Symmetry: C2
Subunit: 230 residues, 2 copies
């Protein structure tokens, strides 16, 4: 009977689009569903941006590694600062890798988890939609049975029970989503706070640690210059 319900639903929907049947107005919930889709779209966009940010960090890392490798190739082992340069180059690579792993774990993964939560809510919104069409389909059938020339009390009674069942199942989903949607909508704030405080914390460590190695790099060049001074 799950198959036949799907046929009566689709028939009700097409009769509504053809101006042959009236639908239950649902403009208030549609505004709520619109906010939900906007929130999910925003979330998906930030998620793709964060993956692109992580990919750009890896590009920055590799180009920095390329410069440091050529510098090590051209830096003679006869020169002062050669051993210190190796430590700078190794630790630079370690900071980039640590930063990439922590970005993936604290920012990209956190965003993936937030975005993945919308899937079950979207399925419930879709189900609520189907139950509302079931209700209008049950009203249309009830009105046709009641308006028939040949009165059939048993057909009337079945149409009336289907009406009642469709109202209750729709209202269960409607009550659940009207409670969940504003709480989910408000939770986007906490999501943005977490993501950007995590990025901020990780970059502060990154700047402080990179500044130390960067200062050592200047000192390596000072040692090289002094060794060859007249």
């Amino acid at each position: 009977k799950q198959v036949q319900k799907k046929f009566s639903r689709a028939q009700e929907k097409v009769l509504q689009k053809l101006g042959k049947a009236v639908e239950t107005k649902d403009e208030r919930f549609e505004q709520s569903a619109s906010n939900f889709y906007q929130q999910q779209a925003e979330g998906h966009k930030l998620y793709k941006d964060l993956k692109n940010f992580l990919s750009a960090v890896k590009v920055m890392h590799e180009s920095s590694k390329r410069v440091s490798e050529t510098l090590q190739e051209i830096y003679s082992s006869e020169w002062d600062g050669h051993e210190e340069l190796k430590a700078i180059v190794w630790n630079n690579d370690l900071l980039w890798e640590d930063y990439e792993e922590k970005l993936a774990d604290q920012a990209v993964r956190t965003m993936e988890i937030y975005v993945a939560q919308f899937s079950e809510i979207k399925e419930r919104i879709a189900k609520r939609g189907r139950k509302l069409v079931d209700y209008d389909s049950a009203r249309h059938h009830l009105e046709a049975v009641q308006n028939a020339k040949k009165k059939d009390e048993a057909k009337t009674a079945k149409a009336e029970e289907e009406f009642n069942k469709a109202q209750t199942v729709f209202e269960d989903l409607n009550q659940e989503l009207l409670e969940e949607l504003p709480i989910l909508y408000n939770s986007r704030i906490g999501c943005y706070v977490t993501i950007f405080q995590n990025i901020s914390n990780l970059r502060d460590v990154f700047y402080r640690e990179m500044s130390k190695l960067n200062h050592n790099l200047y000192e390596v060049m000072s040692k090289l210059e002094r060794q060859h001074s007249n």
Copy 2:
């Protein structure tokens, strides 16, 4: 007569390759020319690496801009910190642009100027090479004229003057390059010192200024969180 000299040079070179004529040995200068080509190759490689580093910085900048633009789109103007966020996003973009312009000017351009200096020295090395082949060509001609059955005093005298002229012009170029090449070779040290002290100075400003905006970003999120706190 500049055309005929080029023919006698190429004829001398091919007779040497065919084991039919002896060349002046020039193994010591060849070792010096090898050091010069290695230095130029190293310089060109670092130069391409620095252009790639600047291109990676622009990639990092754009991805950072992409994240900041989405954050500004999703950050309601109803929220505390909205105006401060705009200033962070604008100043972040300004720091990246300033860093890219200074890298191009202080590191990439400095390296371009160093690499461009090798062109005139390479032309002088090539010329010295040609003058050495002119000298061996003048020796081969002199020996053939002197070994002839029919003694020709006027042909002998011309071959002897060509010998003298070829020796002097070769030695002028040889003296010039033996003086220039070790000084140029030693100057690679000063080049590396300048490039990496410039990169170091620019990144220190970059880290300090970015750390300030990055700290403000955490504070924007704290303001957003407090506004929506229970």
